[PDB]
């Protein structure tokens, strides 16, 4: 096809305010401040050849340690998970290689197309270490990306900002704005 | 001013390439005295931070910022490899 760039979004993307530049302290998170937002994903060109299927890596929800009972809302544990890259899987688009379904209950952190999928990244290291090297005997990779916008995430503080990192505000700056940037 | 390290690219990668330390510009040509070796690294071309939020309740079918706890995590992955040459010193 002719060269060109696509574009993906979400009608209810979890984007509080524009944190790239603000003239006054942002209002206050009410209920559902999600916005209809789109973006042009990171560019990726790659080709893997081998006599065994390709292997990828992505962060998923690791198994918890049998101790402290996971309080609801507690941050889930991470675990790098090796998987077989299947036809139709999604490529990291700028939000890294992770399982958004099992790591984002929100269902609104990223555009629809990766929103309930897993973005996997070729595990080049593992494949090349492979003793016989059947999984891949040749490859070409080309990826590039830059920050277009800087946003805030609505929701509630999962982990508070240690107060030794700042001086308490007052009035409007009395309440700390979400420092969960993306 | 507010900084900005522009776009990141494969073509500009420094890592995942072998470095052949044959001729050093210093007098110590790669000798690891003390059987020690220091490898310092800084790579901001993989600084993606991922936000993961858990729901406090899996009931209501209506979004409530109060129902979800937002967090941030970042992962780094390394793999160091070396080729060493045995050397002798007549004392």
């Amino acid at each position: 096809q002719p060269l060109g760039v696509g574009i993906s979004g979400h009608p209810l993307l979890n984007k509080l305010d524009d944190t790239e530049n603000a003239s006054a302290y942002a209002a206050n998170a009410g209920v559902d401040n999600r916005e209809c937002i789109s973006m042009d994903y990171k560019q990726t060109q790659l080709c893997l050849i081998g006599c065994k299927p390709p292997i990828g890596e992505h962060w998923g929800k690791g198994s918890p340690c049998t101790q402290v009972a996971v309080q609801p809302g507690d941050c889930p544990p991470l675990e790098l998970i090796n998987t077989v890259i299947q036809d139709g899987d999604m490529v990291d688009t700028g939000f890294g290689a992770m399982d958004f379904t099992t790591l984002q209950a929100n269902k609104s952190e990223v555009p629809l197309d990766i929103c309930t999928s897993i973005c996997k990244y070729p595990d080049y290291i593992k494949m090349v270490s492979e003793p016989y090297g059947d999984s891949l005997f040749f490859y070409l990779r080309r990826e590039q990306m830059f920050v277009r916008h800087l946003f805030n995430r609505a929701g509630t503080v999962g982990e508070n900002v240690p107060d030794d990192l700042y001086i308490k505000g007052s009035g409007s700056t009395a309440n700390l704005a979400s420092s969960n940037y993306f | 001013p507010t900084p900005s390290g522009s776009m990141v690219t494969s073509d500009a990668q420094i890592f995942n390439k072998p470095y052949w330390l044959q001729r050093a510009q210093g007098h110590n040509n790669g000798i690891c005295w003390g059987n020690q070796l220091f490898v310092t690294v800084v790579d901001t071309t993989r600084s993606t931070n991922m936000s993961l939020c858990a729901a406090i309740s899996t009931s209501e079918t209506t979004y409530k910022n109060t129902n979800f706890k937002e967090y941030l995590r970042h992962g780094e992955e390394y793999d160091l490899q070396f080729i060493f040459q045995l050397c002798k010193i007549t004392l």
Partner: antibody
Amino acid sequence: QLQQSGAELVRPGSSVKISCKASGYAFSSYWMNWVKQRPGQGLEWIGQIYPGDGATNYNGKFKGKATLTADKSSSTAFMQISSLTSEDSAVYFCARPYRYDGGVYAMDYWGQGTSVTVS
Amino acid sequence: DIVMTQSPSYLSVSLGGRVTITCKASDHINNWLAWYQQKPGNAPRLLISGATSLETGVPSRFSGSGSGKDFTLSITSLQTEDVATYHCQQYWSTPLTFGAGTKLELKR
């Protein structure tokens, strides 16, 4: 709806642990605020607790005297007072922050109050 | 800390008239102030938040206003059920502070 403990009578020097059980909402999203009122007198702020990680802020007056805790599994707040004296005899109240993890816009839901007599 | 004080600690009033209770902060709290009403056997009841906002269930004869450091609660056509002690509270900075209270009594 918040439920507090019944009346207490403790001897000077002793100690008491009082509960405030939460009901009618999702506790795991809210702090708990506690205050003090002596007979025929005004209100004073003790502290507030984030149950999740046990973080809490103290009014200097109640630093060594008060400790706050909470049972997430049963959604209950607790406050313990140490080395009790005649000045600690008062009615204590538990109260919920209006705005989730924020402590502004006042306290919108209060407990019935628990009376403590040191004698 | 921020110190809240109310003008009088007591007022003798008549049913049907307008009653005003003003509170003044030791510092600027910028409309971050609440009013509570308390009767002899129960917890204080929130009437005002954000200096001017009426809470659900609060009769419309109650209202509040002011700014900076000076605020006031106003009750029109005072009802007998309105006879109680009223408190202001600042929440602009911790520790949170309450005024000493103003008790309404009926004159005879």
